[PDB]
Amino acid sequence: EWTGDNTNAYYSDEVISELHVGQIDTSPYFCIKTVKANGSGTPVVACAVSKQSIWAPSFKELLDQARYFYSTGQSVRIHVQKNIWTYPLFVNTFSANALVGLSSCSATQCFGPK
Amino acid sequence: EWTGDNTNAYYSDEVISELHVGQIDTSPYFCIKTVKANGSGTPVVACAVSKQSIWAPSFKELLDQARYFYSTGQSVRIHVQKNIWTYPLFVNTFSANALVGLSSCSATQCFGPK
Amino acid sequence: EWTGDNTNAYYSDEVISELHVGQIDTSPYFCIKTVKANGSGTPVVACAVSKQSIWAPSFKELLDQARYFYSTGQSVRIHVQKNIWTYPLFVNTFSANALVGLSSCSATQCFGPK
Amino acid sequence: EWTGDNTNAYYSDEVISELHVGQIDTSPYFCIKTVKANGSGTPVVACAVSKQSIWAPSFKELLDQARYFYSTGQSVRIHVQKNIWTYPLFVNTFSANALVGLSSCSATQCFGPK
Amino acid sequence: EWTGDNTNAYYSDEVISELHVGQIDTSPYFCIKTVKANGSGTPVVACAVSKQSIWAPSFKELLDQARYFYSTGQSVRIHVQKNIWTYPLFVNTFSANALVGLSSCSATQCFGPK
Amino acid sequence: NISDYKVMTWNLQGSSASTESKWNVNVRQLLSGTAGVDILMVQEAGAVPTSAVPTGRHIQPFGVGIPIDEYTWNLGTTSRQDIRYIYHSAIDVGARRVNLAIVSRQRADNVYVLRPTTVASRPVIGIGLGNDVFLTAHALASGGPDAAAIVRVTINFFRQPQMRHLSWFLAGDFNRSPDRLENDLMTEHLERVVAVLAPTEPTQIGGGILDYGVIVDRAPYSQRVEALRNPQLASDHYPVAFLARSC
Amino acid sequence: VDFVYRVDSTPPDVIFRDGFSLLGYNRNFQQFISGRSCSGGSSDSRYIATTSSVNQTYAIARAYYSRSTFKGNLYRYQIRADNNFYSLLPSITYLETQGGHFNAYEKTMMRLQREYVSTLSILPENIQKAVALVYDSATGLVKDGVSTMNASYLGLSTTSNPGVIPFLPEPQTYTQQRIDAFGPLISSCFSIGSVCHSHRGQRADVYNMSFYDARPVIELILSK
């Protein structure tokens, strides 16, 4: 029950490239799409749903932080837990990833858990 | 109910060109007007009312995100549910569309449901 | 009640030139001063008081939106209800006008009720 | 109680020059330091404590407005109520002044009470 | 309990260089990394957890202020209480410091307790 | 100031068959766009572009009086006009053949014509934009014997009390190496009034450094102006650019 | 406007001799107002930023003096504006009719600057006086110090150009570029480094100001 749990996954040196806001099952939600800053790898998609999952209490803070990093376009580490969202159309459009953390990154390292 | 429900309608590659904030029946509301980035098609008008409709829980989130996209002037996809607002004077001024989602767009696609 | 009720008054093609924030009778309040974008006419002063009048639920949204239009300095339409605030010193300082709406304006029209 | 009560003090044409945020007695608080824009007088120090004094309901509104004027560095009028905070160490560090209002200024006047 | 309690520790002329947001034990939290403006000394790391410790009520206020100073790169005095966080995984990644205050700095001094 | 403009000199080596082509192809590309050269000094231009239009402006120059023709020359299209100004001197005295031209991104406030004491010389022509003056010259082809006199007449004219506030820059074909011109001026006791700005490479196929610039040293930020040789065009003379160094 | 101002660490006896020089030949207007062509960016702007606001010059000085790594002395130079000095708005307006777009960050930014731009270098003849800017570190107060008249100044009858900057480049429809700022949302083009410090015989160092991106800062204050 922590962002830094080893059962979670992270992707370093990413830049938030897309932002979406909507509603599902009476619950406001947002999703972000991030890609490697250098152009490598495959894009990462994560979502946060307001009234759902164990990460529900951090919905507002994660949204404010996602918006911030999206505006600055700075290098970040994105933390997710896989296979959380279940609606097939929702997952197909976005992913099953729950956003659980965001850390700013410098040249050599990122300011977050491993 | 989901933003990406096929019974909803969406419009891609739009730019949020107008913003309005007011009150109706004890409820704060906002409306936006969007136009195609290239100048084609018909302008889209959508509104969100704080204490009304099924999309009520996402009023704050949609307002903050609409404000954001309005400031950047970036090309977006706007998701609406048609025929929701019923007050004739309100609809003529704006429309009957309920704002249900906002998705950022790249050159080829938009980060949202279709 | 609606921002666009014919019993309310509006002023088009205005620029928010001043912003004030304070408290009266346990209630946070704010006031704005607007002038015509072209430099003509007389200034318009309106206020919103958090715990007072029927427009109370829209206090925060109008404050955030007023600050925004104040920051950008864009041409707006201001919607007011006249003769609402009663404290003589308050009215002398500002006015009796209650702020009930804010609409962005283009060159030809404004995105709000008439 | 009003921002414009004559027993309060105000200073025109000031620049919010410093900002502090902390906690005292389970209560989040902030302090600002203001100086005359033209270089005259002595700096003024005011604070707002969230759960304390009669000005408590306006804590958030004043914090946001102080942050705003702090960023723009624009000339403002600051309204204070003297001798509110009592903790000696607190008063010595900052002052006993409670921040009671903030008004934007033009060249000739400020948009607030006196 | 006050940010300026002498039993607390502070560091002057620091710049917030990194920012992290996550969740632990159902509680949203954030951590910052600050470094001396001149490039000297050792970095300071502090954290604030929303539902934990006595500094809990100031979580949002400290978060907004930390986020703000981070964007401007402003010189700050960072106030911490040592030995608060106990979870081994949490402390190893960041530190045991609880964020209790933030003060803006000029050339010679900082606007906060001593 | 001189560094505010992109300045350039070029000797067309004009003829009845090549000149139009040189204007329409080479001169056009040097000038085109907002990044294009603002002030162009041109030598051996017996003709202006055929698409250039007389402004009918009667020019009374400072110095002496020879007829200077003003032209407009649209480097853009009909729906998007980029109008440049051309100042052309063709016929001198009974000897005629000046063939000097200055192209400008804007209309001259004043025009200058100065006659060096060497009577065999072509005159020196210039235009004034605000506090800046841009002049061109074309010394004689026998090793540029009048090059020093050309600089001298320019120096002496702008030393006049009324003229001292102006920054002036002279560029063209001196027909003499920059080294020797500095020696000539040194002999004329004028070597320190001005600074010669030349490219390191030859400007004529053969061949030596014949095309360069001279800036009055009292001109503010004169030390920023650098002579840089341009890629060759359709003459045996390389165009030379005078640009402000990065900063 | 009849008079505008710049701030510089370069002494009056030098500035009165040389005036202020452009960084380069970059005419791009949007790159200038966002500060991208100024000393923190490509450092090649073909404009000099001035302000009509004395208080903004105090803010510029305060943004340098408040740094503990800064040790120099600052002056305010009073400049007579002529037809090569332009306000922002008529060029913002024009470029918009040419398919250009300025976002809310750029427009909030410009509004705070009281900014007039010079298309040419600024001559000693335009510079009427220098007033020293003095900083009281205890209070943060900035006050006028010694004032020095420039002898070479010409009290000509000129004023700022109310029209559109000439030779403006066309682009672009959308940018979303970094907005370089310092102090309390001051455009980076007001940095001491945003005029070319090529002063002969005067090899003094210019303090390098740091800049932050003003977009996220403005978004934060625009939010709520």
TrEMBL record, chains A, B, C, D, E:
Disulfide bonds join 31-47, 105-110. GO terms for cellular component: extracellular region. Coiled coil: none annotated. Residues 10-110 form the Bordetella pertussis toxin B subunit 2/3 C-terminal domain. Keywords: Signal. This is Pertussis-like toxin subunit. The lineage of its organism: Bacteria, Pseudomonadati, Pseudomonadota, Gammaproteobacteria, Enterobacterales. The gene is pltB.
TrEMBL record, chain G:
One of its GO terms (cellular component) is extracellular region. Keywords: Glycosyltransferase, Signal, Transferase. InterPro entries: Borpert_toxA. GO terms for molecular function: NAD+ poly-ADP-ribosyltransferase activity. Disulfide bonds join 38-189. The keyword Transferase applies. The keyword Lipid biosynthesis does not apply. SUPFAM superfamilies: ADP-ribosylation. Gene3D superfamilies: Heat-Labile Enterotoxin, subunit A. This is Pertussis toxin-like subunit ArtA. It comes from Salmonella typhi. The gene is artA.
